[PDB]
Structure 1
Amino acid sequence: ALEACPQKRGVCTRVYTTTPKKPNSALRKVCRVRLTNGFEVTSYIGGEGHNLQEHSVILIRGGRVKDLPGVRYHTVRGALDCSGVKDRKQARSKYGVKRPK
């Protein structure tokens, strides 16, 4: 986070998929982000589905993904272009999802 900041905005460079390590197997969704800090790191995209393109531009929280070595940050859904998970009836605090009527 550089300036020891809780969060840090940035613009996605590419939204590709990655495969877990030896014990796990899947297509985890990640994305290279060029934070304002001046660093280009990879962040994980929580949720069952997202809408992050090339010029996504999202805020970074910070969290390592055990399965994906290198991914030390998590994207904050519900902020900027990163739309909150759809139909999230559960932990809406995370994934940034407004409580349905």
Structure 2
Amino acid sequence: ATTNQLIRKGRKTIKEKSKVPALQACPQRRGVCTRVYTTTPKKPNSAMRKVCRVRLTSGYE
């Protein structure tokens, strides 16, 4: 990466998206539970973990 190449093209820092899109950059968000169920974990662990499918005011389910 020569000086001429850096001035012509540049450096590029791609921007990582948020891991919590449904909050829409909010601390919390209100929803209604559309389902309250249990599920089994990944390979090392075993349990009946309690999950709820919830539709938020942000339009995500």
Shorter-chain TM-score: what band? 0.5 to 0.7
Where does the alignment leave 5 or more consecutive residues of structure 1 unmatched? Answer: 41-101
Rounded Cα–Cα distance in structure 2 between residues aligned with 1:20 and 1:7: 25
CA shift, 1:28, in A, is: 0.2
State how far apart, in whole Å, the 2-side matches of 1:25 and 1:35 are.
29
Q: Give CA-to-partner distance per residue, 1:22-67, whole Å, 9 cap, x none.
A: 0000000000000000000xxxxxxxxxxxxxxxxxxxxxxxxxxx
Instruction: Figure out how many residues of one structure are paired with residues of the other and give that number.
Output: 39
Q: 1 or 2, which has the higher helix percentage?
A: 2
Can you give the 5+ residue segments of structure 2 that lack an aligned partner in the other structure? 1-22
Q: Which residue of 1 aligns with 2:42?
A: 21
Match of 1:6 in 2: 27
Superposition RMSD in Å:
0.4
One-letter amino acid of the structure 1 residue matched with residue 40 of structure 2? T
Q: Which runs of 4+ in 1 moved over 2 A?
A: none
Report which of the two structures shows the higher radius of gyration computed on alpha carbons: 2
After TM superposition, the score normalised by the length of structure 2 is: 0.63
Calculate percent identity across the aligned residue pairs. 85
Q: Which has the higher contact order (CA 8 A, sep 6+)?
A: 2
